[PDB]
Request: fold
Amino acid sequence: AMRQCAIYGKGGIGKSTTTQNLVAALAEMGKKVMIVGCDPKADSTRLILHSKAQNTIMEMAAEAGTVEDLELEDVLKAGYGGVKCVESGGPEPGVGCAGRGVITAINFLEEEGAYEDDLDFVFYDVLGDVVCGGFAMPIRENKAQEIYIVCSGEMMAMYAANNISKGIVKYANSGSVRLGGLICNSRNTDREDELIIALANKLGTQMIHFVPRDNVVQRAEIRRMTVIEYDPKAKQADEYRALARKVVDNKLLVIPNPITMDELEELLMEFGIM
Amino acid sequence: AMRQCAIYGKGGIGKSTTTQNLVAALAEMGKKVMIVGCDPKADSTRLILHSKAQNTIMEMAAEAGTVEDLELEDVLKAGYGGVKCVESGGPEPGVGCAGRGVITAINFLEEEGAYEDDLDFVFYDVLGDVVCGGFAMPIRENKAQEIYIVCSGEMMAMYAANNISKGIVKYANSGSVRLGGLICNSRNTDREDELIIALANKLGTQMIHFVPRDNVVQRAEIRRMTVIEYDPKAKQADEYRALARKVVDNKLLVIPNPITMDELEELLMEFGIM
Amino acid sequence: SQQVDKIKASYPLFLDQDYKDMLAKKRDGFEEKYPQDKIDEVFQWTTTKEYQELNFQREALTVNPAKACQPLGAVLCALGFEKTMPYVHGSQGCVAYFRSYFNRHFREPVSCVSDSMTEDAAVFGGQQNMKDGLQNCKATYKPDMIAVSTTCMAEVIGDDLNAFINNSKKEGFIPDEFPVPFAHTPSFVGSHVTGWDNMFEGIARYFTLKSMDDKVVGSNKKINIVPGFETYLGNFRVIKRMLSEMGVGYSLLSDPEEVLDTPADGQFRMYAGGTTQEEMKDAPNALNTVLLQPWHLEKTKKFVEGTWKHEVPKLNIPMGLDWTDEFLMKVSEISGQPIPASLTKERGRLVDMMTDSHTWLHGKRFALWGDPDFVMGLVKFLLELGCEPVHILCHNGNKRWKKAVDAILAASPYGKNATVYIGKDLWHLRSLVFTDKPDFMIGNSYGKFIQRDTLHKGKEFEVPLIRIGFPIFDRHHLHRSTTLGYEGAMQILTTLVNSILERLDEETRGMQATDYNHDLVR
Amino acid sequence: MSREEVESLIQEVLEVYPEKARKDRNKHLAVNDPAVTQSKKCIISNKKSQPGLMTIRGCAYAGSKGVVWGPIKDMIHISHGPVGCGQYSRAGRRNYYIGTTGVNAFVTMNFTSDFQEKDIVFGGDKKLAKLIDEVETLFPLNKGISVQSECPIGLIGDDIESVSKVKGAELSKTIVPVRCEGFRGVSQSLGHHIANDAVRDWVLGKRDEDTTFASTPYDVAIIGDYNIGGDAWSSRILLEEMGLRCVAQWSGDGSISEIELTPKVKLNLVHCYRSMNYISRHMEEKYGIPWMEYNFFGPTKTIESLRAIAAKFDESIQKKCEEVIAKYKPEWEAVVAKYRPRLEGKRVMLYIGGLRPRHVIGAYEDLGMEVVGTGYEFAHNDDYDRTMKEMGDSTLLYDDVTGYEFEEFVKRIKPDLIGSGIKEKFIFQKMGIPFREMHSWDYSGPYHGFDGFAIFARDMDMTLNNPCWKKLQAPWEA
Ligand SMILES: Nc1ncnc2c1ncn2[C@@H]1O[C@H](COP(=O)(O)OP(=O)(O)O)[C@@H](O)[C@H]1O
Ligand SMILES: Nc1ncnc2c1ncn2[C@@H]1O[C@H](COP(=O)(O)OP(=O)(O)O)[C@@H](O)[C@H]1O
Ligand code: CFM
Ligand code: CLF
Ligand code: SF4
Ligand code: ALF
Ligand code: ALF
Ligand SMILES: [Ca+2]
Ligand SMILES: [Mg+2]
Ligand SMILES: [Mg+2]
Reply:
């Protein structure tokens, strides 16, 4: 047991939200899971805690001076389905160095055990942009062993996915972290399913699942909760449960095989029209 | 003449794409505009150059050793409608410090004149996340004088907008940069228009425009171009032209008045259901 | 043991048998050091051209650099202004280092503060540090001005110094009118001299930019002088001497000669005389501006010409005969003041010293390093003496500067076998003095280890170091010396000639063997 | 004199501080009272230094490269980051060694990755790798490497750990990645803890499976002695003279080999508590190697330690210990006999790192001098507890003293001699107060042990009673 995963993807593509709901389905399956938010905005855990956690690793550490003076109890809280949640702190937009925040945070958890438990899964909900080595912390030597890139059939989202893949390569070769697959969070693009599958193949991975765009996600989001909790009978809920099973049963872990910009354009023209 | 603007917003909310199309409308109005990409991924100028520019300030500087050895001619290229485009370089995801890249890039342009011309508008297409002081470069002392935050009626997108507003405050008070308004790039959320307007008011600004979600944007995007160029008669094109006029005629510039997380939740409950 | 009457310190002490034996046992017992043979072998290897080549193929490793990061220069520049307190926004560690680095070279106190940014200050961006730091600084040390510089940390996280300072004032942390000039000084760009440049330019902007309206060139009848990174008290003083000697109205911008030479009379003066803020505010009204060390005052040059509209003369650092002549003549032209017979005679005397010593000098090959301007000038003077600057190394040098020096070398037969090296550290030079061995090497204290290495190969391979430059830590008060003008020239000349004679006396001190050439008169 | 006059002094100085800073500083100024064993006695340490108050603290980098890692002879230490840290730090500390600098020993040298802008923007992780190769090629005789993180490295998040592990496995060389970014922590203190952990994880464990080393019942190790001016050697000679076998010195004339050997020692002698206690505890809980603190500053303290140490062994050792004490007795005795009269009753104020401020007190009292005040830059309350039993009742205590504070304090206290760092020296010399560097021994010989004591004594007299002091005021003034 114990599978550390890292979620990445185009900014605002829905990684946080999807991860939130996904984990809910895991918890519903009796799977003990912990989610480590790696976004300066502690928004990786709202749907589980039913509230925007303020006890972030960085802010908390600052209160007690040195991060060394911090203690897990103060930053780790369990929410829906007993899912444990932790949030790397972060400066407000346009100031500081959020990257370092994540670095220190991950190191903190590592040293205070945290992972050291009976957790079935650990999810690193990283920010969309990932502009530095710091945000790649979850993909280091002995952290996440499987990454899942969220994206849509949108040119930009696909580029981001491929671009992110490139960065992953540097870490895949130096360790054992592998790309499990792509999770298409539908954004109603024309030949969406075909597009993502095409890209997935080109990269050498798979399209783990196609999450339909359903406003239920938002309706539940508004009420601070995952679709599962908000409406277990909702069609979208089954979709998330499906994705959960897919991830649990996934045995396909590969080293991303990126494509050139020209190759991407070519792919878009062939699978993105009509 | 000469209005420097900075575009910010939730990651992947569509800032780049909207900016691309928006500028196209400006160019169509005979407005000479330049766009400075501030995202490590040189994706801020694709739709104008009809190709993903490789001549980024950072990569180019690296080729010539010191950034001091770089020359504008090598990194500045004009595309559709004579719109001049420049791209701050950047490391691949998970390595380096993209923030510094932007800092050096902006400084480079500043020193080599660049802005120093007869430009009607200059647009800083910053990345969604903005995790450091570096990405706030465009909002410094004598850079952008008006910021426009792109967002949707999505809880997360709104939070991001408000969170970003907070960061802006630090710079607004130290200089003259002001928030012009919010541009709602529709993502088909229930009471979207009401939500954004509500937030806009709460912040003390306005909802400059509501950009409808139209797959035409994608169809044009695929063919490396702005909706204007791809289909001038397309309904969406008129929408962008409208937004352009709105920005040109905008005289409302304010210092963002952020709200507490609780206040945001409250707003979501009142304007986001039914 | 120790003999109370004649106590032996570390040096003679650890040479005692019981100590030697202990070290021998320690080495043989737990050090596992390489056999003396292997050591001797690898050493002889490090002196070959083969090694040197691999040494020069380095693209990442820098060994024993001949430079320092920007902030150091920013600080020195800051110290040149009246009751100004250097403030480095960033990690406190740097400031401690800066202070000590200068403490050791000047053997004087070095006042500088840091707003002590730590872990969370880096993550969250230390705007508070700026606010509190400034307030605390003013209140505690009561400076009239605070010159903000930076640390790589603050440079990476893009801390908007200006925004912070502005907000610091607006939020009542310090009086809105309190002079707080700033400058971004990324450790990882250029070097200490660049820091000096940036810091100066920032200060120049602060007291000028806005108030440029009432300014008129020449109205103050003064000639602005920018020393740049200068670590010889004599260098500031000589310029001021000559200028006053000609009766030239001048204004030395950034003059820390006083701060770096406070008299020890039972009283501690934290701040001392320096460039008054008024001199800075009035600076644009000057006839023109002369940059003593142009090669690292690039940004300042552009600001002076661009904003101050001063037609800065293309003058080289006033070092050696020719360049000092050019400097004086240019100043003479700008101020309309004729070069006094006072200086004319002084020039004549230097020439006389040159003629008296040309015999021993002519032909002596040297290796040297230091800041661009300093080196460039040292080279010119060396050429004027008939010496050969075979190995000219300037770690913080650039392509254009190299060309400049090359042209200077191509102008004289003595430069024939010289080679300019930019972006090269002292380890590179170490190889040069081994492969193509010069007579002596002119440089800072860091070269003492190169001489140690050279001697270890053999006495005839030893290349004596002549301490001229920065920093000089193993010699007391050399920072008082002069290198600029005829005065500096004379000192350098004397120093060189005597250095030559010294080594000769040593080489010929062997009684019966080499003492036959031990002449009383030379 | 008198805690009342002192408390008034503290309160007076605090007056210039803006309320916020005033509040904090008061907690770091206290009047000593023996018996009190805690912070109760208005003394809190190891906290964020107030911005702008010009403190004398350093950075984590200084803690690792500067004091702990740098001292290792046969090992190349890379100042990873922009030039500066390495340069300013190059051959500053007098951690003496025995080696052919450049071929097998590298202390004197400053190896740096000389970060340039493009290395930050793109992350010099590749540069590091290439650098290492260049090192192996140009310095074949190195027995290991260590990357000392400068601020940038911590921020940009360069996977230096991986670069070290990959290159290490390839080249079969020990490459130690240290995260001593200057900003991390509050002083050089955390740097120590970090460096210690680095040693623990990357070096110590190397010889755990190896049993080839021939151990003896008297195998000891000196930890926390950086051989400043020869300090370690002067201490080692005594220990070995009394039958002990110093297997390793931690960061003195230290080699990677002896560091790896350390886990085989029968006892660990800790001199510098603040810097090595971390690893000392680890070696105990793991290898079961007991550790004890000791002091070699002054004969009384030295003798006290020598006995306490020999007491941990059998009679042959203890008997020898006495022979040693006997041997050196006439010497240190002659020393005090000559110098004490010249320094009798002379008052001294101190301020140093995180050990000496209390450790040297003994030595001072042995020459009849009285330490009227002392303080540390980075010491934690651990040290302060120990400090209180050393300081005479009503002596002034200060943690992370601001420049302004030390000045004012000195103004009223009017000590006959002051001992602090380089950044202090000239300030007080200007004031006419005999100053002596207690970090670098003011370029003087060892102070540790008996041989060092003679030197320490001479130095104090030399300066304290120097004729230069009478000449501060010009005759034409009064
Ligand atoms: N399948 C979906 N259907 C509808 N809205 C969705 C769906 N997935 C995500 N969203 C909405 O997209 C917005 C951003 O999601 P978020 O997870 O915060 O993005 P990111 O992970 O990239 O930071 C929120 O309103 C989110 O609920
Ligand atoms: N109004 C819209 N209708 C449809 N798709 C849109 C619209 N606006 C943006 N998009 C799509 O959203 C995806 C991301 O846009 P992008 O500008 O790159 O995001 P960001 O600015 O935040 O980096 C691309 O497919 C983009 O074309
Ligand atoms: S200021 Fe020692 S805790 Fe440390 S360099 Fe000096 S009083 Fe250090 S005894 Fe030591 S050899 Fe030191 S003298 Fe502890 S090692 S960080 Mo500055
Ligand atoms: S607290 Fe310490 S010395 Fe400072 S940076 Fe941080 S690790 Fe280093 Fe380095 S190059 Fe110069 S001295 Fe810095 S400004 Fe950067
Ligand atoms: S790009 Fe990253 S490493 Fe750089 S300042 Fe920003 S958060 Fe930090
Ligand atoms: F908050 Al995100 F991509 F997870 F912008
Ligand atoms: F590329 Al973006 F927000 F503009 F992720
Ligand atoms: Ca002095
Ligand atoms: Mg997120
Ligand atoms: Mg973008």
User: Anything to note?
Assistant: The CA atoms of residues 162 and 182 of chain C lie 7 Å apart. The first strand of chain C starts at residue 62 and ends at 63.
